Amino acid sequence: CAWIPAKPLVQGATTAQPIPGPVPVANGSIFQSAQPI
């Protein structure tokens, strides 16, 4: 029957929340690199 529950092929959350960047250090540089891999 169609009313029988079934897991989808793509499980879990299907979207992600962006994370705000870190607080920039108050040096003399406009360039503020994030933490690199």
């Binding site: 108050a26 040096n27 003399g28 540089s29 406009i30 360039f31």
Partner: protein, 303 residues
């Protein structure tokens, strides 16, 4: 006179600002708008912001408008309301920017935030470049950048060129001028100076430091060759051994081998090299082969 001409203060640095703008008032030297659609598109954007809504689809051929990029240098400790100079460079296929006028242009850094607004008149020298110009005091600062200056008790002086001996001389000069624990050498282009707390004390300390005089120790011997401009510049510390030089279409004023004696002074090196009687273009090959043979003592750098 010497500290300010050899070192830089930590946290005191410039930045780069870029922006996009338009130049009007040209005498028929603007770019072809049929090949550059961004000029007409941004003109429609400017008119729509002003209040004029042109219809789409209709062609526009312009001769007095040129799309340009604007570059600027953000000075240290900048305040809003101050003025800086900008450089205006044409993009696309414009002919010249003679007697042009730059409209309003936001200047943004790498953080995609505005820092200055630029508007003024372009000065072209009028051979000379025609698609580039410079505007004096053409931009106004409108965003200030917070600094860490004033806090802490240590400040680093950064040398322009790395040298352990020069850093030791700078540290010894500061120590004999101010006190025992005034300065500490960290590495070959970093000297740490202890300063009291407060902004006024640090400003007074830096004003006393920057005008000090320090003897400059002899540096590394180095010979620089620029083949693109055809220039060869030697140094005061360059020495020479004795060797033999052979070169095409060169002879003794009558064999093909010319002997170069060992030289210690710079004037002896210049005299020995001018005895060969070669062009600078040939002298580049002579100096490269001499450095490969080990007769030349200085290090060779090709810029």
């Amino acid at each position: 006179e010497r500290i300010r001409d050899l070192t830089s203060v930590q946290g005191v640095r410039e930045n780069s600002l870029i922006g996009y703008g338009l130049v009007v008032g040209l005498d028929g030297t603007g770019d072809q708008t049929t090949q550059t659609p961004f000029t007409t598109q941004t003109l429609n954007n400017m008119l729509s912001q002003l209040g004029i809504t042109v219809p789409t689809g209709t062609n526009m051929q312009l001769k007095n408008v040129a799309a340009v990029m604007v570059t600027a240098s953000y000075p240290p400790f900048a305040r809003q309301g101050q003025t800086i100079d900008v450089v205006v460079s044409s993009m696309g296929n414009a002919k010249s920017l003679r007697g042009g006028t730059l409209l309003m242009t936001p200047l943004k850094g790498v953080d995609s935030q505005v820092y200055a607004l630029a508007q003024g008149n372009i000065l072209v020298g009028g051979v000379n470049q025609l698609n580039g110009g410079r505007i004096t005091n053409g931009a106004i600062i409108e965003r200030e950048l917070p600094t860490q200056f004033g806090a802490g008790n240590t400040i680093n002086l950064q040398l322009n060129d790395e040298d352990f001996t020069m850093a030791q001389q700078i540290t010894d000069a500061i120590n004999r001028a101010r006190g025992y624990g005034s300065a500490t050498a960290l590495d070959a282009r970093t000297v740490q100076v202890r300063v009291p707390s407060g902004n006024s004390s640090q400003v007074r300390f830096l004003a006393d430091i920057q005008n000090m005089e320090v003897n400059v120790t002899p540096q590394d011997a180095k010979v620089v060759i620029n083949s693109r401009t055809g220039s060869v510049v030697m140094n005061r510390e360059v020495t020479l051994d004795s060797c033999a030089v052979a070169q095409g279409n060169l002879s003794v004023t009558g064999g093909s081998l010319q002997s170069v004696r060992s030289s210690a002074n710079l004037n002896s090196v210049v005299r020995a090299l001018n005895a060969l009687g070669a062009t600078p273009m040939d002298l580049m090959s002579i100096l490269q082969s001499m450095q490969s043979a080990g007769c030349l003592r200085a290090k060779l750098e090709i810029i």
